[PDB]
Amino acid sequence: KVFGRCELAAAMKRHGLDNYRGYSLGNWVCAAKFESNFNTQATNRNTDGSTDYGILQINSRWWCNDGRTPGSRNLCNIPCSALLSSDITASVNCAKKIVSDGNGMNAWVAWRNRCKGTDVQAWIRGCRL
Ligand SMILES: [Au+]
Ligand SMILES: [Au+]
Ligand SMILES: [Au+]
C-alpha cells in the first residue's frame, strides 16, 4: 500500500507515535517519506546482507526474522514480511522498541540525514488530525 501523506499521519497518530519518545508526528512522517516513500511494500538489501522492510525500513539484523540474515536477532518477535502489510500496526510496535533502544530516531539513517533539524512540521501541513 502506498499511503498518502495525511493518511499515514492519521494512522501513525492513532497508533500513538505522535511524540513517542518525544518525537513529534512530523518526524515520523518525514522518516517514512525518506525511508520508504510511504510504500508499505518497500524492501532494500543492505551491504551487510540484512534487509530493511516496510514503511519505516526496519532491519532484519536485530528487529525481525527474514531467514537469511546470519547471526541476527528478532527482537520485535515478527517475520519481516509482517512489516510489509497494508496495516502498519506491526511496524509501529516495532518502531516503538527501536526508538527506545538508546539512540532515538538516529536509528533511522534517512531521518538523521534528511529530517533531523529540519522543519518536520511541514510533513503534517493540511492534515486534519
Ligand atoms: Au499493500
Ligand atoms: Au494501534
Ligand atoms: Au493500522
Curated annotation (Swiss-Prot):
Q: Per the record, what are the reactions this protein catalyses?
A: Hydrolysis of (1->4)-beta-linkages between N-acetylmuramic acid and N-acetyl-D-glucosamine residues in a peptidoglycan and between N-acetyl-D-glucosamine residues in chitodextrins
From the record, give the cysteines joined by S-S bonds.
C6-C127, C30-C115, C64-C80, C76-C94
Give an example GO biological process.
Answer: defense response to Gram-positive bacterium
Q: Which residues form the C-type lysozyme domain?
A: 1-129
Is Disulfide bond given among the entry's keywords? yes
CDD domains named in the record: LYZ_C
Enzyme Commission (EC) number? 3.2.1.17
Q: Does the keyword Nucleotide-binding apply?
A: no
Keyword field: Allergen, Antimicrobial, Bacteriolytic enzyme, Disulfide bond, Glycosidase, Hydrolase, Secreted, Signal
Gene Ontology MF annotations = beta-N-acetylglucosaminidase activity; identical protein binding; lysozyme activity
Question: Which residues does the record give as substrate binding sites?
Answer: D101
**What is said about its interaction partners and assembly?**
Monomer.
What does this chain do? Lysozymes have primarily a bacteriolytic function; those in tissues and body fluids are associated with the monocyte-macrophage system and enhance the activity of immunoagents. Has bacteriolytic activity against M.luteus.
Q: What else is known?
A: Lysozyme C is capable of both hydrolysis and transglycosylation; it also shows a slight esterase activity. It acts rapidly on both peptide-substituted and unsubstituted peptidoglycan, and slowly on chitin oligosaccharides.
User: Can you say what this protein is called?
Assistant: Lysozyme C
Query: To which species is this protein native?
Result: Gallus gallus
